[PDB]
Design an enzyme around this catalytic site. Structure first.
Site, PDB file in Angstrom:
ATOM      1  N   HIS A  44       0.817  -1.212   0.000  1.00  0.00           N
ATOM      2  CA  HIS A  44       0.000   0.000   0.000  1.00  0.00           C
ATOM      3  C   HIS A  44       0.852   1.265   0.000  1.00  0.00           C
ATOM      4  O   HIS A  44       0.308   2.373  -0.042  1.00  0.00           O
ATOM      5  CB  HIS A  44      -0.984   0.012   1.183  1.00  0.00           C
ATOM      6  CG  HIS A  44      -0.344   0.209   2.528  1.00  0.00           C
ATOM      7  ND1 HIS A  44      -0.009  -0.840   3.361  1.00  0.00           N
ATOM      8  CD2 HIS A  44      -0.023   1.338   3.205  1.00  0.00           C
ATOM      9  CE1 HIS A  44       0.525  -0.368   4.473  1.00  0.00           C
ATOM     10  NE2 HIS A  44       0.517   0.953   4.411  1.00  0.00           N
ATOM     11  N   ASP A  88       0.210  -7.860   1.611  1.00  0.00           N
ATOM     12  CA  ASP A  88       0.638  -6.459   1.583  1.00  0.00           C
ATOM     13  C   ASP A  88       2.166  -6.396   1.552  1.00  0.00           C
ATOM     14  O   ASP A  88       2.830  -6.131   2.547  1.00  0.00           O
ATOM     15  CB  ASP A  88       0.072  -5.725   2.794  1.00  0.00           C
ATOM     16  CG  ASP A  88       0.273  -4.204   2.720  1.00  0.00           C
ATOM     17  OD1 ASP A  88       0.580  -3.674   1.631  1.00  0.00           O
ATOM     18  OD2 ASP A  88       0.121  -3.540   3.761  1.00  0.00           O
ATOM     19  N   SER A 181       4.546   2.201   8.079  1.00  0.00           N
ATOM     20  CA  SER A 181       4.258   1.191   7.054  1.00  0.00           C
ATOM     21  C   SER A 181       5.488   0.865   6.225  1.00  0.00           C
ATOM     22  O   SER A 181       6.234   1.755   5.826  1.00  0.00           O
ATOM     23  CB  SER A 181       3.182   1.697   6.100  1.00  0.00           C
ATOM     24  OG  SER A 181       1.886   1.421   6.557  1.00  0.00           O
TER      25      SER A 181
END
Ligand SMILES: *[C@@H]1O[C@H](CO)[C@@H](O)[C@H](O)[C@H]1NC(C)=O
Lengths: 223, 94
Positions: A44, A88, A181
Site C-alpha cells: 500500500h 501487503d 508502514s
C-alpha cells in the site's frame, strides 16, 4: 512509532525512507534494504513515483550520509488486495545500487516459512508519527512482542496468520503508527515482518505482513 | 502556495500505517464538495473504494478536524471552509 525511543544514529543501516506521489497528494512510508538494488516495503506504499532515502537519521536534514535513489520498478504482490490489506508486500528495484558502507547495508531475511513464537521479542523502527498530535524528524524504535493469533483474529476480520503476524501487547502503548508502514520487524537481527496496518487509534495489536510466507515470491522477483 | 493536509482512512476497522497527505492551496475558501472529491480520490487510490462501494457499505463518513479544535462529521451515504483552518481529515467506511 508510539512509545519508543530515538534510535542510535545509523544503528539500523538497512532502513529506507520512502516519499511517494499519490493523487492527489503525497505519502510517506518506511522500508528496508534487502540487497544493494532492492528495498522491501508494503504494497500500500505503491505509487507512480517513489524516491528512496538510505543512510538517514534526521530525514528533515540533507545529511551527508544520505543516498537518494529513485525506484525503477515498484513490484506489488500479484494478489495484493487493497480493500482487506492482504498480501501487503512490495519490492522496489532501485534505479542504481546503493553505495554500501557502515551506514547503508541490507538486512537478512528469514529462511523458508521460518516461524516466530508468540512471545518473541522484536524491534520495529521508523519515522512515523509518535502520537495523534506529534511527529518525529529522527528514526525511532520500540520493542514489541509477537502475540497469539487469537488477539488479532477477533478484532481484524481479514487477519490471516499464514500470511501475517499479530504483534503488540494491548496492555502497552507501544506500536508502529502512521508513517511506519513498510518498515521491518526485526527479531534476532532478521526481518520477519513488514509494518502493515492497525487501528486508527494506534492501540495494539497490529498486523504485520509475514515475510517468510513470501520468500519464494521474493526470490523469483529479485532475479 | 500549497499545503499538505494529513488524512487517515479506516475501512472495516483497519487503517494502513501510511502517513498520507492531501494537497490544498494556502488560504483558500473551498466548499465541502471540494473536499469530498479529494476524499473519494484517496479512498479509491488507497483502499479501492469508489461510489458503488460506499452505497453498498453500512455507514460511511469523513470528519474534518479543525485547528481550533472543532470538527465536522459529513455523511458519505446521504458552507465554505478556509483551507488554513483544517488540521486533518479522517475517513471511516464500514
Ligand atoms: C523525487 O525527487 C525528484 C527530484 O528531486 C522530484 O522531482 C520528484 O518530484 C520526487 N518525487 C516524489 C514522489 O517526491
Amino acid at each position: 512509532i508510539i512509545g519508543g525511543r530515538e534510535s542510535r544514529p545509523h544503528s539500523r543501516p538497512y532502513m529506507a525512507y520512502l516519499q511517494i506521489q499519490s493523487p492527489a497528494g503525497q505519502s510517506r512510508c518506511g522500508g528496508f534494504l534487502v540487497r544493494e538494488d532492492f528495498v522491501l516495503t508494503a504494497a500500500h506504499c505503491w505509487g507512480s513515483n517513489i524516491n528512496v532515502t538510505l543512510g538517514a537519521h534526521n530525514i528533515q536534514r540533507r545529511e551527508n550520509t544520505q543516498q537518494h535513489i529513485t525506484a525503477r520498478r515498484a513490484i506489488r504482490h500479484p494478489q495484493y488486495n487493497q480493500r482487506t490489506i492482504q498480501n501487503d508486500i512490495m519490492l522496489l528495484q532501485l534505479s542504481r545500487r546503493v553505495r554500501r558502507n557502515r551506514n547503508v547495508n541490507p538486512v537478512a531475511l528469514p529462511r523458508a516459512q521460518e516461524g516466530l513464537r508468540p512471545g518473541t521479542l522484536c524491534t520495529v523502527a521508523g519515522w512515523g508519527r509518535v502520537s495523534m498530535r506529534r511527529g518525529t524528524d529522527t528514526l525511532r524504535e520500540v520493542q514489541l512482542r509477537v502475540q497469539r493469533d487469537r488477539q488479532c483474529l477477533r478484532i481484524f476480520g481479514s487477519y490471516d496468520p499464514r500470511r501475517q503476524i499479530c504483534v503488540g501487547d494491548r496492555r502497552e502503548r507501544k506500536a508502529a503508527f502512521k508513517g511506519d508502514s513498510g518498515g521491518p520487524l526485526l527479531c534476532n537481527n532478521v526481518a520477519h515482518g513488514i509494518v502493515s496496518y492497525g487501528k486508527s487509534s494506534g492501540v495494539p495489536p497490529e498486523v504485520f505482513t509475514r515475510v517468510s510466507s513470501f520468500l519464494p515470491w521474493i526470490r523469483t522477483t529479485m532475479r | 502556495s500549497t499545503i499538505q493536509i494529513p488524512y487517515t482512512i479506516t475501512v472495516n476497522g483497519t487503517s494502513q500505517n501510511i502517513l498520507s497527505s492531501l494537497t490544498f492551496n494556502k488560504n483558500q475558501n473551498i466548499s465541502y464538495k471540494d473536499i469530498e472529491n479529494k476524499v473519494k480520490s484517496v479512498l479509491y487510490f488507497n483502499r479501492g473504494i469508489s461510489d458503488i462501494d460506499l452505497r453498498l457499505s453500512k455507514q460511511a463518513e469523513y470528519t474534518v478536524h479543525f485547528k481550533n479544535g472543532t470538527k465536522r462529521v459529513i455523511d458519505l451515504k446521504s458552507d465554505l471552509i478556509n483551507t488554513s483552518d483544517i488540521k486533518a481529515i479522517s475517513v471511516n467506511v464500514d
